Symmetry: D2
Subunit: 341 residues, 4 copies
């Protein structure tokens, strides 16, 4: 019965903890610690009150022992006691004391294989970097696709990105059935926590601009990450992302060149079958006239909007929605649950 | 000189009149009447104050004369005296007595050949439908591409849409140089007037949804319209539009298969060259990391963002911005100006 | 028990029906009919999918029995079967046939005593106008304040407005304990369905302006409505509303002159004591550092934010939140429930 | 001429530089240096492209002479050569060499007398802190009210806040005419650069919350600041600020108890006369139904909205708009100009 810790109690970290309590299936592992540079009182406040996902439907108590700070959290007839830490430098964390089996690295600041190793030094056995790899990882994993390819010897793992976890299924499903010559991705994405309120100095001159006022083209880490999960598609895939002023939920627009005959009907039927069989854990398809809000708090890795499917000659476009926060958080727990032996 | 009337004093109609006063170049025609179902005081207020384009830099006085209502408008060293009408039925408009050469039909309600002809019945010599054709038109015109083909028998002209005026040049330039087998268009567009503030009954169930809260995929009239200007593109292009919570400015994302070798470098050089020569009146290209608000109040039909160009194999993506209100308005003025030398 | 109909399935009508299913209290009456000008498929879609309140957690099945349309709705262990009408004129509705005890009039168009009685002609026994009075009503009711005052002969009742149901308790509690010489109200309010997406002709020149871009001061009906509930406050109170770009939830800021000694502590203690006793059904008090989204889907008529209370000399300001949709809907259900024997 | 430096090239600093170029009448002093922690290319990009105020109508060329970085800026028939620094510690800046007469302190981080004096150590003869006094200042100045009270020996000056520069004139004008017993302010203010895009750890739990999604009550420095400027009003005035999802422009809502007879007419007439006589430089009054975006890029410290004025008994509300960025930036330049140039 494994022991998970979360480093970085932000949009992803907090949602991982909520999704644990809200899941209709109880997970076999326990989350037993969290860390963030903010104090516990700020953390509990933000865990309880969320502008995107609403009030946490449960009870949180804070316990100060002589040394340690704990949360006692109850919801949906489940209970966790969760040590809270406030240590900026992940090597100085007490992962050995706490017997931590997996650390979920959700800060965005420790994606290098070196930085992820800091958690290995502090005592943890295994790290899931919750982002695209910066350089080296023992594996890059998309739950529902290649999670069985985790070797019990692998110690630094990447759960890639929200975008990746939606792209890879699409690419795999379509490449297996029709063959993909090349494809280009357009992602339309809600604002993210690293953007700016008003125009302000920032590393990226596009993300420096007022996030509430602009359509903002930007890079996606998803293409680099898809190469690692499917090296057979090197040089065959590119794309980018566009930030717009919604609070949550994203869509992927994938345009590809088929290597065999295609119709709108054949593509949709294939995606329906995939969703009903081999991918039913992470994938759904709808034909209802829905918009982004309707997928807020959806646990799926992608939801294909089949009415958007288009074909001209050898070229086609498919479209899928996903909750970039709730889908990924759920896939993190699904991944941790897959290590059970 | 020519005598222009404007039917429907909305986003487009008001921006047409504003752009006449703001144009660096005076036009060789006059706007002599406007018609709306709204009261003159409402129209003058909205003409003077605009949430998108700022205050009209000028003065407006209402006078009554012979029981007719006029606006006297002074700005940028020009004055217009403009009759104001309030007739919901085009056939009952006094175009014959006003000696109207051109009606700009900007209501959205009279796009059919028969409906547009009502202005002809009322005595105007020529209508421009400020929208895509519904059924039939004498001619579908994109200024700077095929405005020279207008013949004196073309009485009902469609100036198509914002999107078509950006898409048609892109397709043409690229098809002429490299050849397009097929292409798919994704437009990312600011909210439009016909959308909803909150979820509300509406003919279209996606545009029924709260416009400030959602990413909303919907149809685009632009592909139908492009096919009327370039019939050879039938069955070779398709696309769709996405509404997002910004007030103004749109982007087109065009994905195509080239029929000859492409690189990013070569595509960009072609588009730059086009912008300097044959399409200098309507088209610019930038290489700066810009966002939508940077194009607000730009008069160009399109501004290629050369930093977004991508190529994999035979497949490319190009990206261009436009102010969907100010570009189109200026193109309506340009079209009228071309009607007599 | 008792049989209710809803005329107008908009933000209010739809949320009344949702709130029926969601209420922890089960109500001893049934909604047996809805009427809108829109078709049933649009209505069901909007009932199921909401940008503000999320997906309805339940199922709807549309059946045709006779030539009558019905919704079979199941949620929260509860079930209703509701006839669906599409009649634009209330006198033509089948209320006598259906044996309607109470019509909830939620269109906004039949607020006058004459228009409302059309339901009574059509066969309904009692109408509740879900809006401030236009001219005369038999009674103007704030649930939890003066609902005991409904006479069995009262046939045309007004449940006033969301703003009125926050304001009246506040004014009453404070005037009763300390005395209010005069007071002024500033409401800060989310956008409402009658506002504009872009600058558009509108009867109100302020509400003509782009609702996602602007702070928009406008009128509030709550002052007239309050004066019908409390005629003593004629000439002693005024105020206005400011619309800002949020989707739901509002706040009242009430500045009053006290007729007797006041402190922050004493005002807060009073409001707390009222919330715990005579007003526990409709009122809460918090001292947590919360924001508007934290009150979305709150059923309270008002939640006082005690940290905002200020006193200078004889002048004070109190501040209360409310979900302007969900509070009002629940108060409508509470009012209907109060009519039982 | 007099020689000014800007410390902190953000929303205020950048607008100060733009306002220099845009002012119809040329200022007779020059801005010769800017310092920020961000790289010069980021600074020049943000200076040229602004989501709120549009593109700079000018050209900027970056030059390296010696080991010094210079901005050569040309706009509106005016030229400046501006050294760019990147020194986080103000004691280390080369103000002695540059013979700086006045440093505009626009970072928000150096508001204490000791912090501001670091600029004096570096050789600057005078500092204007562009914010409320933190501990002590030689003078707290509202331009147009008490800028004449500056002494030649005053070295650390506060120009207070945008809010204070609107509040003080109102309080003063109304107090001088009718007498204010007490007053309470509500400010409705656009989002600021220190807020959050999504729910995020922050020192302040309300400003932690998604700024595009929420109404957020918070504190204002203006009340403390007004006390420094007008000591007689100790114990007579309080208030607070509310952040809402617009990008720029704020309003003051001021409720006061008057010590002599008042009417709406008399209050408005007073404010109009004040604006035409003693306050013409900094104040305007409108009687048209305007909204926030109509004041974007307005240089006034306050524009009174005479249609909002209300009176009940001895109590009154007045309402004023201001562009929080452009007003304050203009007032900084005017205060510098008041020292002679
Ligand atoms: N938000 C999404 O939609 C999404 C989806 C998939 C993956 N991701 C990835 O998740 C990661 C985090 O993103 P987020 O949206 O949760 O951002 P966030 O800013 O909400 O979370 C970052 C958190 O880390 C904390 N923190 C900062 N420095 C720290 C340190 N030294 N030690 C510990 N905690 C520290 C912050 O206080 C904060 O709570 C990134 O790699 C991001 O790319 C995000
Ligand atoms: N705004 C854009 O981005 C854009 C770009 C290109 C084309 N268009 C097209 O322009 C047309 C108008 O769109 P808009 O954005 O100006 O919309 P709008 O709703 O702002 O304009 C419609 C106007 O027509 C008036 N009107 C309605 N019925 C009338 C009647 N019977 N007679 C006279 N006036 C009447 C209304 O009062 C309103 O002023 C549409 O066909 C639209 O597709 C819009
Ligand atoms: N939403 C709020 O915050 C709030 C709170 C209190 C009171 N109110 C009041 O309630 C009323 C309705 O407001 P709303 O927000 O629900 O508006 P809405 O526009 O969302 O709903 C109006 C509904 O009435 C329907 N309708 C129109 N004409 C009809 C007819 N002849 N017969 C039947 N149905 C018809 C429309 O199709 C629509 O579904 C207004 O008077 C409003 O001021 C609103
Ligand atoms: N924006 C408004 O409406 C407004 C109005 C009145 C007063 N103010 C005040 O003006 C100040 C600045 O606010 P702003 O809106 O310009 O914010 P901002 O964040 O846009 O500007 C701050 C700037 O300072 C720079 N900076 C940070 N640390 C620095 C350092 N050590 N040395 C030099 N430069 C450094 C940052 O890179 C940034 O460019 C604050 O005190 C604010 O309250 C703001
Ligand atoms: Mg909106």
């Amino acid at each position: 019965m494994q022991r998970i810790a979360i480093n970085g109690f932000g949009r992803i970290g907090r949602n991982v903890l909520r999704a644990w309590f809200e899941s209709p299936k109880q997970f076999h592992f326990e989350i037993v610690a969290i860390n963030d540079i903010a104090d516990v009182h700020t953390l509990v406040h933000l865990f309880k009150y969320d502008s995107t996902h609403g009030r946490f439907n449960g009870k949180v108590d804070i316990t100060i022992e002589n040394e340690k700070i704990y949360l006692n959290i109850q919801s949906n007839q489940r209970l966790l006691k969760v040590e809270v830490l406030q240590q900026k430098q992940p090597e100085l964390l007490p992962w050995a004391s706490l017997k931590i089996d997996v650390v979920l690295e959700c800060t965005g600041l420790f994606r290098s294989h070196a930085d992820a190793t800091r958690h290995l030094e502090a005592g943890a056995k295994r790290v899931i970097i919750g982002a695209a790899p910066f350089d080296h990882v023992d594996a890059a994993i998309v739950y529902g696709v290649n999670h069985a390819d985790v070797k019990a010897t692998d110690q630094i793992i990447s759960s890639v990105s929200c975008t990746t976890q939606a792209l890879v299924p699409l690419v795999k499903i379509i490449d297996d059935a029709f063959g993909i010559e090349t494809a280009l991705m357009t992602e339309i994405h809600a604002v993210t926590a690293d953007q700016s309120v008003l125009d302000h100095a920032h590393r990226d001159l596009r993300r420096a601009r007022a996030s509430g006022q602009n359509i903002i083209p930007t890079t996606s880490s998803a293409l680099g990450a898809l190469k690692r999960v499917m090296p057979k598609m090197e040089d065959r895939i590119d794309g980018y992302s566009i930030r717009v002023p919604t609070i949550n939920v994203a869509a992927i627009d994938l345009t590809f060149i088929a290597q065999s005959p295609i119709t709108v009907h054949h593509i949709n039927e294939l995606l329906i079958k995939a969703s009903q069989t081999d991918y039913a854990e992470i994938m759904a398809v709808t034909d209802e006239p829905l918009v982004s809000s309707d997928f807020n708090h959806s646990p799926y890795s992608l939801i294909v909007d089949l009415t958007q499917t288009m074909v001209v000659g050898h070229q086609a476009k498919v479209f899928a929605w996903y909750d970039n926060e709730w889908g990924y958080a759920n896939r993190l727990l699904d991944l941790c649950d897959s290590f059970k032996s």
